[PDB]
Amino acid sequence: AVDFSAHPWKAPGPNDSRGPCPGLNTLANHGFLPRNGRNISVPMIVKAGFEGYNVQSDILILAGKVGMLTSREADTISLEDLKLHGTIEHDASLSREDVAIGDNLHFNEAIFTTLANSNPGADVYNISSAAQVQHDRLADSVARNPNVTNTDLTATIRSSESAFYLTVMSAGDPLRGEAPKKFVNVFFQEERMPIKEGWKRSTTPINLPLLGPIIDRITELSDWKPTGDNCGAIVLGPGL
């Protein structure tokens, strides 16, 4: 029963907190989360993701409580807190630079080129294109970042994020694991719901059972291999 017309996109001001996640950033830019990006709890994320995207509480509780670790507060974050490297934030992002060699927070068009140019000859991104992008992004980090971290955990998180953009920005059947380029590009480049472009919130719930096989197929097609430590240890709080 959400009224999207009561949730206009507004550009964030210079002091509105935004993070490395286009999903949460977009929700804030439409006021599903606080536009200032501050004082955000897991219940707020659960509600916002449901209302905005029809993403269910299973994934948002699991991911949300991990995200909470990035702040110094008892039960809230600022979106910018999520840039904390090695909690969720990882190398070989789709649209951000690796923290060791650049800006791990803001959208970067040069990084995004790989995704933007994927699935040549189609007007959608899909599971095979998403896998290719992941392969190529990881190769770039291995080439250029002397502090690169690549573990089973980061690889899984990366495939989860690719599954998110394929499903949440779909043309309405998220099971298909494909999304119009026009919608995904707006999502990343503007952190806006592409409403005027024709996007509508999925009428199918997006939950762990739906995402699981998509995640696994993306991983499988990405020709991923362990390269190093492979210990899936997360950073448990800031300033440790």
Ligand X SMILES: CCCCCCCCCCCCCC(=O)O
Which residues of this chain interact with a copy of itself, rule CB under 8 A? Answer: 41-43, 46, 57, 61-62, 64-66, 68-69, 72-75, 153, 229, 231-234, 236-237
How far apart CA 82 and CA 186 sit, in angstroms, is 22
* Among positions 8, 10, 62, 106, the unique one binding ligand X when judged by CB under 6 A: 62
Instruction: Give whichever of 126 and 156 is closer to ligand NAG, judged by the CB atom.
Output: 126
Q: Within 81-100, which residues bind Mg ion (CB under 5 A)?
A: 89-90, 93, 96
Nearer residue to ligand HEM within complex by CB, 88 or 214: 88
Q: How far is CA 139 from CA 25, 85, 149, 202, in A?
A: 27, 19, 12, 33
Region for residue 84 given its phi and psi (left: phi exceeds 0; alpha: psi -120 to 50; beta: otherwise): beta
Give how far the C-alpha of residue 25 lies from the chain's centroid of Cα atoms, to the nearest Å.
Answer: 9
For the window 172-211, what string marks contact with ligand X as x by the rule CB under 6 A? ------------------------------------x---
Which one of Mg ion, ligand HEM, ligand X, none interacts with residue 32, CB within 5 to 8 A by kind?
Answer: none
| Gap between the Cα atoms of 225 and 209, Å rounded | 25
- Residue 187: alpha-carbon gap to chain centroid: 10
Binding residues for ligand X, per CB under 6 A? 62-63, 66, 88, 156-157, 160, 208, 212, 215, 236, 240
